[PDB]
């Protein structure tokens, strides 16, 4: 759904990005990969974070979780110290916890549903202690339901960024009251980015997006 407030998310896979072109293409926001696990740092993060801001894009950072590698508390601190920090400046979104299918091992990272709930709660608690913000959770409905056992525990704690490509509207797990961001394509096109780009829609007005960035709503 390309209507209303639109954005993209990128990582080093997108290479060199011309953010002024992303902005002139009509994008309002972007999430940029910063860290993964305990010691991976996206090589394009600093430049993207700087250039997106200078181009006037409301932007934030995301952490790709590896729950098997360390506690939720540990990865939240790592993220907050390496790109996930937040402060009010009209252009910084609250950080994102990208927790999804394990790319190298059991899909739920060897954690029981109860341990996974604890891990996510710990990441949220530490990220909030570090930044004052409620971390945004990026995941798929399948992963959420399977690995957390259809948990409703984050409904009042974390905005939901749902990944559901190729559908007219996203399916939302019962554990979230609604979706805040929705990644509807991983094969889009946007000026300034060469090749496939992830496209996102924000569930609300331009003012609501700014309020989310500034922590006023």
Q: Does 145 bind Cl ion (CB under 5 A)?
A: no
Q: Does 78 bind Cl ion (CB under 5 A)?
A: yes
Tell which one of 18, 68, 118, 145 touches Cl ion (CB under 5 A). Answer: 68
Q: Does 177 bind Cl ion (CB under 5 A)?
A: no
Choose, from 36, 98, 134, 198, the residue flagged as catalytic: 98
Given the rule CB under 5 A, which of 1-9, 10-18, 44-52, 118-126 is the region that contacts Cl ion? Answer: 1-9
Position with the least CB separation from Cl ion: 105
Tell which one of 19, 109, 119, 202 touches Cl ion (CB under 5 A). Answer: 109
In the chain, alpha helices (H): 19-24, 45-54, 72-81, 113-131, 141-148, 206-214
Query: What SS3 state is found at 7?
Result: strand
Tell which one of 31, 188, 201, 213 touches Cl ion (CB under 5 A). Answer: 188
Catalytic residue list contains 36: no
Comparing CA positions, the residue from 205, 210, 213, 97 lying closest to residue 157 is 97
For residue 211, what are its two tokens?
């309020």
Binding-residue total with Cl ion (CB under 5 A): 19
Which residue number, 191 or 195, has a Cβ lying nearer to Cl ion?
A: 191
For residue 119, what are its two tokens?
């891990």
Residue 185: beta bridge partners?
199
Place of tokens 């990128």: 10
Q: Does 125 bind Cl ion (CB under 5 A)?
A: no
φ, ψ at 124 (rounded to 5°): -60, -45
For residue 172, what are its two tokens?
């939302």
Q: Which residues are catalytic?
A: 9, 98, 100
């Amino acid at each position: 759904d390309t209507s209303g407030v639109q954005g993209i998310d990128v990582s080093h896979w997108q290479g060199s990005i011309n953010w002024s072109s992303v902005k002139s293409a009509g994008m309002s926001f972007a999430y940029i990969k910063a860290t993964e696990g305990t010691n991976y740092k996206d090589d394009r993060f600093s430049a993207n974070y700087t250039n997106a801001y200078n181009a006037g894009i409301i932007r934030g950072a995301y952490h790709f979780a590896r729950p098997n590698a360390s506690s939720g508390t540990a990865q939240a601190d790592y993220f907050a110290s390496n790109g996930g920090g937040w402060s009010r400046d009209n252009r910084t979104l609250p950080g994102v916890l990208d927790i999804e299918h394990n790319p190298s091992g059991a899909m739920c990272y060897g954690l029981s549903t109860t341990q996974m709930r604890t891990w996510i709660n710990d990441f949220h608690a530490r990220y909030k202690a570090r930044t004052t913000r409620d971390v945004v959770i990026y995941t798929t409905a399948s992963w959420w339901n399977t690995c957390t056992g259809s948990w409703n525990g984050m409904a009042a704690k974390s905005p939901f960024w749902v990944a559901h490509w190729g559908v007219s509207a996203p399916t939302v797990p019962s554990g979230f009251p609604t979706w805040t961001f929705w990644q509807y394509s991983a094969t889009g096109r946007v000026g300034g980015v060469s090749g496939d780009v992830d496209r996102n829609k924000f569930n609300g007005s331009a003012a609501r997006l700014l309020a989310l960035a500034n922590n006023t709503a």
